Design an enzyme around this catalytic site. Sequence first.
Site, PDB file in Angstrom:
ATOM      1  N   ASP B  82       0.865  -1.181   0.000  1.00 46.72           N
ATOM      2  CA  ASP B  82       0.000   0.000   0.000  1.00 46.72           C
ATOM      3  C   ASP B  82       0.908   1.240   0.000  1.00 46.72           C
ATOM      4  OD1 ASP B  82      -3.204   0.760   1.628  1.00 46.72           O
ATOM      5  OD2 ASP B  82      -1.927   2.019   0.456  1.00 46.72           O
ATOM      6  N   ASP B  93      -3.457   7.399  -3.040  1.00 41.43           N
ATOM      7  CA  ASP B  93      -3.368   6.242  -2.153  1.00 41.43           C
ATOM      8  C   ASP B  93      -3.737   5.035  -3.015  1.00 41.43           C
ATOM      9  OD1 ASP B  93      -3.596   4.339  -0.069  1.00 41.43           O
ATOM     10  OD2 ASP B  93      -5.288   5.308   0.884  1.00 41.43           O
ATOM     11  N   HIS B 153     -11.908   5.430   1.959  1.00 50.51           N
ATOM     12  CA  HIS B 153     -12.006   6.644   2.741  1.00 50.51           C
ATOM     13  C   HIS B 153     -11.933   7.914   1.925  1.00 50.51           C
ATOM     14  CE1 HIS B 153      -7.479   6.652   2.410  1.00 50.51           C
ATOM     15  NE2 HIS B 153      -7.641   5.339   2.406  1.00 50.51           N
ATOM     16  N   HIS B 161      -7.473  10.225   5.964  1.00 49.77           N
ATOM     17  CA  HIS B 161      -8.779   9.681   6.333  1.00 49.77           C
ATOM     18  C   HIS B 161      -9.618  10.847   6.810  1.00 49.77           C
ATOM     19  CE1 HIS B 161      -6.348   5.957   6.598  1.00 49.77           C
ATOM     20  NE2 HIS B 161      -7.475   5.379   6.225  1.00 49.77           N
ATOM     21  N   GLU B 187     -10.991   0.911  -1.237  1.00 42.38           N
ATOM     22  CA  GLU B 187     -10.097  -0.186  -0.926  1.00 42.38           C
ATOM     23  C   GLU B 187     -10.679  -1.485  -0.364  1.00 42.38           C
ATOM     24  OE1 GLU B 187      -6.799   0.449   2.335  1.00 42.38           O
ATOM     25  OE2 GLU B 187      -7.751   2.404   2.184  1.00 42.38           O
ATOM     26  N   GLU B 280      -6.465  -1.242  -4.250  1.00 43.12           N
ATOM     27  CA  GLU B 280      -6.937   0.100  -3.966  1.00 43.12           C
ATOM     28  C   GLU B 280      -6.516   1.096  -5.016  1.00 43.12           C
ATOM     29  OE1 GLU B 280      -4.963   1.819  -0.587  1.00 43.12           O
ATOM     30  OE2 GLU B 280      -6.596   3.238  -0.234  1.00 43.12           O
TER      31      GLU B 280
HETATM   32 CO   LIG Z   1      -3.758   2.599   0.828  1.00 42.91          CO
HETATM   33 CO   LIG Z   2      -6.454   3.858   1.693  1.00 41.32          CO
END
Ligand SMILES: [Co+2]
Ligand SMILES: [Co+2]
Lengths: 295, 295
Positions: B82, B93, B153, B161, B187, B280
């Site tokens: 990630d 992200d 998110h 977030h 995600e 994601e």
């Molecule tokens: Co991530």
């Molecule tokens: Co994320």
Amino acid sequence: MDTEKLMKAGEIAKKVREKAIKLARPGMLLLELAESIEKMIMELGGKPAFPVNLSINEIAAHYTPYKGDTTVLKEGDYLKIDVGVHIDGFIADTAVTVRVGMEEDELMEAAKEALNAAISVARAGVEIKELGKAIENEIRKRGFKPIVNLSGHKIERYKLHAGISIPNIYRPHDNYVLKEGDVFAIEPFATIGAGQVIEVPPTLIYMYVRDVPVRVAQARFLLAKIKREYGTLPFAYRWLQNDMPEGQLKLALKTLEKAGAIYGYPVLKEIRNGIVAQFEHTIIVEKDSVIVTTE
Amino acid sequence: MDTEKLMKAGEIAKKVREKAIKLARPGMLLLELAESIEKMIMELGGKPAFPVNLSINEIAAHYTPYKGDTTVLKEGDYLKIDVGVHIDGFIADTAVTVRVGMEEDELMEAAKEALNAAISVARAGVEIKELGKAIENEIRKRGFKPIVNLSGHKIERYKLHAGISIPNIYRPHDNYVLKEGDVFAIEPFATIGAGQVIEVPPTLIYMYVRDVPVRVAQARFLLAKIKREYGTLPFAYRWLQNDMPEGQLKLALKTLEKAGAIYGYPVLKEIRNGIVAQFEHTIIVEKDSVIVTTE
Ligand SMILES: [Co+2]
Ligand SMILES: [Co+2]
Ligand SMILES: [Co+2]
Ligand SMILES: [Co+2]
């Protein structure tokens, strides 16, 4: 913006909820119970924030009787009475579980204690994940499972579900910080089933979402009516039953739902038919504590 | 402010992500892998939005190597990489799962398809619940379980977030409506386990949360460095292991935690130790579609 109306709505919600508990006796017709509470809300000076939900056993939420409903309460039924009142858009949302004609048991105690535990940690500056952890631990330490897709929620003027929710499980990134003035309904749901609800027929509750150019007149004017009569708050199919023959009524709502003008909220049942218990209070976040408006 | 900085952050996250996949070979040190990825992010012109997470098998998230970590990739390992990049606060992200030295399986495919499903329905005007449903349906029809307490998110400038989440399950009241200009990371996490993650030691990632007076001097200088170099984005314990010896670092970090200046994020592990797969992407919501900044 004004705590007076939130407190008034809460006071009314408390009164009607406590009367609803007295009426919940074996043999009471659900329809009769629903209409009494909603009339009582009126006689006291408020308007319903949504139709009173009377959900039995594995039915978690979204059940409100309809004209012609013959369902009667039976001894041993785990009846969830969920009542909402609003004073000028300021809402009070509260709920209690009654085991008809019997005494409270451990499943009910888990949901009620989970609620007490979340209220105890709530204050301005606390992250939502803290309430979630409190709720989940109380439910699980008693051997029950929390319902993962049904939760508490932020309440705004004329907006029952404002976007931010208070889950009944700990989620590491639920990092929204409770602010002074925030209004939230905390509602733990506990069950002996799997811990998840699914939507099932019928659809007894709807909510207006957007003005969509609908061609057929009957549906077009129903949207206009729904719009200014109910606005942005949930309404019951029952509330419209005497306005037009049931056949065209069902068709109009379908047309409005199919066009995305209003959304339906089907009855929610626990996936493994597990009994569901629920308790709920609405709170206003203060700097160091919270005011429970429906207590 | 600018979709350009968001686009830029995503381009770098993608390149870096694609590089990480090539380096995820048997025998690779997680520490070597994390350090290379992060250095490449800086070489390309961005700054890490959070430390590179390298979570293997039942470890779902929040694992980032530390100096002295001897963990190496083994053939067969389900490595969840990630990565996040920011350009002056604007974040990208993204994440991928690789079965080290092997080809993708059904578990990985479920998570990936769940992601593709959510993206195909995302556009301004849709309620979050529709993405939840799309995700949950793709994971469940393949026989797996979506992780109920880890999810997508909302992303805001310097805020990974932002409060609003996109769950991997359908919740009837997830009625936040996507708006033009909203940035979200979708995600899905899938597992063959129970579908829930728990926090376990160590805490290898932290995040500055509030400006509080620190009584201790090294803790105070430490906080000054955090505020200066990482701001409000998560940082790795690893990034500070050179500024001072382990013992001084541990105590200064604890003082800051107790003071309420920073928050620790322990490793997340699947409750029944089931393998976890994750995919994601970051998206910018448009009127009739979405821009996937990380593809
Ligand atoms: Co991530
Ligand atoms: Co994320
Ligand atoms: Co309620
Ligand atoms: Co509620």
